Amino acid sequence: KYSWETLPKKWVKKMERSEHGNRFDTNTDYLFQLLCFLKLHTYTRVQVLIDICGVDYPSRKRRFEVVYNLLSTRYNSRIRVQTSADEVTRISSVVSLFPSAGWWEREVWDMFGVSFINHPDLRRILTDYGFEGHPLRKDFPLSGYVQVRYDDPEKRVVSEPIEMTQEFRYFDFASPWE
């Protein structure tokens, strides 16, 4: 792939794949710098941040994995630059390069908790207003912690008490022999 020859070797730091869509699992420090490359470059012109997929691996040490997808409307190719930032590592924000990253990074911080550096208006986009907790993590239970909301003598108001529901039935379908 042409993109790996020109790219500074240090920027594609950790990993690199070659199927199911190619990816440059880079380091969080060289990320927005790597996103600056592949865009505003004559032979690699992405210009289009398709998606920013937070992925949570609890068993890693760098829990999350902020998977930046990238389409190249010019050369008709799609590259998936990734990162790895745990719960308390502010990662560089690429809203300055692709302004679509604004809401995607708001969602990545909301769902997961990967705060974004110098991202203007980094505010919970999806979850409730007084939401405490980050849903799309793994350790966040499906039904939520305190997320039932019912009406009450505090009229015109829906409270936010601790939650109780028919227990979500987790089925252990997974079979041995893989």
């Binding site: 227990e167 039935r169 089925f171 079979s175 041995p176 022999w177």
Partner: protein, 299 residues
């Protein structure tokens, strides 16, 4: 190798009945999970499968020998580990039928583990007749308290009740086998349970008072009794903690009359070899000669 595996998993699923929906071990099945992983996706056998009557093997092992693949695992388990030698591979050919030739309930304990031994639904727990499925059951790696061997266990519970008690590997106490006292004691935990603190009224029948009232009446009656008259008989199922709390309670009450239910008068609990199995339960594998002094260890 893969073609050999697919070949054999076609033969096994050839005369095998389509009992997977009505099979008790439908989810937890070696045959289903080997067919869905190593066996072929399709079966060419379109003829009359062989079928086998269901042998009566007692009030524990529900038997559907049509599902059974005649791998002989149980007829080996009953001959070797269980050591009772009742099961047999009667007949030859496809007509092979596993079970006692004469109607003979598996009088041996330790013969409920044949269901975990069985790689197929055929031999299944009749108490756990159909009550649950391999996926509903939330499993806890609990232990057992019926007998003092302290065998390891998986209390497969669905919600608030214990559906099935299944063993789990612990090579140092019970390899993969648990006594029929432990497999099928789960039914106890839901019958005749005491659920409310009942004190005795002025008549003779109980009254399900709350906890404050029952604890108050018990406390008053210990305050108005001579100390050396308090005794603290502790149950055979009581854990270490509650026995420690019972000791520390009936002690500071001015008594020393706490004791477990089974230990008779004047036990020598000073040196710990005097009430232990010093040789590990695994250590008995290296023993040359045993002298079971009474002890009836089968029971």
């Amino acid at each position: 190798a893969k073609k050999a595996r697919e070949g054999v998993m076609e033969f096994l699923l050839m005369n095998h009945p389509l009992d997977c929906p009505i099979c008790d071990q439908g989810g937890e099945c070696d045959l289903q999970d080997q067919s869905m992983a190593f066996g072929s996706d399709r079966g060419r056998f379109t003829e009359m499968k062989r079928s086998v009557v269901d042998k009566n093997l007692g009030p524990l092992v529900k038997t559907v020998m049509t599902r059974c693949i005649q791998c002989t695992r149980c007829v080996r388990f009953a001959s070797e580990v269980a050591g009772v030698q009742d099961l047999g591979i009667l007949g030859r050919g496809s007509g092979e039928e596993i079970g006692t030739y004469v109607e003979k309930l598996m009088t041996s304990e330790l013969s409920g583990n044949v269901i975990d031994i069985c790689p197929v639904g055929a031999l299944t727990s009749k108490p756990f007749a159909f009550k649950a499925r391999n996926w509903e059951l939330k499993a806890t790696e609990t232990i057992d308290v019926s007998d003092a061997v302290g065998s390891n266990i998986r209390v497969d519970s669905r919600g608030p009740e214990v559906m099935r008690i299944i063993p789990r590997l612990n090579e140092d106490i019970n390899e993969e086998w648990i006594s029929d006292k432990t497999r099928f004691c789960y039914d106890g935990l839901k019958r005749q349970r005491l659920s409310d603190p009942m004190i005795r009224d002025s008549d003779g029948r109980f009254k399900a008072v709350s906890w404050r009232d029952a604890l108050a009446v018990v406390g008053d009656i210990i305050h108005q009794v001579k100390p050396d008259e308090i005794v603290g008989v502790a149950g055979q199922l009581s854990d270490a903690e509650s026995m420690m709390v019972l000791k520390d309670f009936v002690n500071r009450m001015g008594s020393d009359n706490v004791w477990c239910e089974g230990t008779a008068a004047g036990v020598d609990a000073d040196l710990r070899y005097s009430y232990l199995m010093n040789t590990s339960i695994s250590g008995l594998e290296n023993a040359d000669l045993f002298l079971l002094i009474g002890t009836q260890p089968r029971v």
